[model samples]
Target: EPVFSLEQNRDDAMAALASTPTFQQTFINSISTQAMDLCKKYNLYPSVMIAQAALESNWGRSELGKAPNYNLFGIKGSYNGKSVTMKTWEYSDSKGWYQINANFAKYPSHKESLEDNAKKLRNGPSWDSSYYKGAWRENAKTYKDATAWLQGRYATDNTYASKLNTLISSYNLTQYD
Candidate 1:
């Protein structure tokens, strides 16, 4: 349902590689491309998809980014009988204290995780009823409301809305939605 061209954005994402941070640009490029594909499929905004990826992936800084898994989304536990596992990791608290964590999902590739995340937004059970409302599809102008709802529920940050708004506005990501 989206109007943007995935091929164009994919190309743009590649071109964007030079300007992005070296440590995280590779991950961002992958996420952006996959998210753009999903957006085109479901008529969702690519920015919303990418922003969630950024938040979930900690801008590609979580344990998922390192070592065995390379599962950028930091998915925990099993979904059914299958789950990805990684060696124990020493994760630091937001204040910087480190603690060991075990049993993280292991992804074959970043693209797999990105597609899983998009499917979650489009048709995942983790979302609440409020997000499934007609307004999501009926009122494109208020799309940020949907993002805010998810942010508050998931990020536990009351200012998540403002931050996401800033990202969206600053990046003009909705132009592709």
Candidate 2:
């Protein structure tokens, strides 16, 4: 027979609540508000930002998502000299998907994550790469175009854009824009 303390029972209940869809949707709503503000300030598409965050963060239920790091986008490398190492996947036309230990940037808040991502979209060296040239069309017109441009370039997931689009349409996330 095992014994459990009241504190342990409370903790277990909290964990269960955190895993619910309602909790995830609330998390998404909170992050989407922040993402929308940053997107508007940066002339990026709010729908794309919201959808990407939802997809990348598993609606704020992934380990990284629940951490204080607030790394909603799974962005790699350090930011302000802060980072968290985690296993991540990369894909290549020649090599296919492979796992690697990566140092992802850690932000103090979800807003910072979205803001940093917006800054990257506007003028990051990564986007200047030959592989991501199509990502920087003038005016940054539409979520569809931005998502398509990010398909293979953003996460190495070949279907990344389609997944984001599905999230966008499924949630009617464009209303935010």
CA lDDT for candidate 1:
0.63
lDDT by residue for model 1 (1-177), tens: 868999999998998786555554455565677777877776566787676666666777776755455566677764333466555545456646554545665666666666666566556455463453422434455658667656645557888777777766765667656
Q: What is the C-alpha lDDT of each candidate?
A: 0.63, 0.78
Q: Encode model 2's per-residue lDDT on 1-177: one tens digit a residue.
A: 999799999998888784445765686678777877887776778888888888878887776766778887777887799999988888899899999899988888888888877777766555353444344445446778888988876777889999998988888898888
Candidate number achieving the greatest TM-score relative to the actual structure = 2
Work out candidate 2's RMSD over C-alphas: 10.7
Model 2 accuracy (lDDT, Cα): 0.78
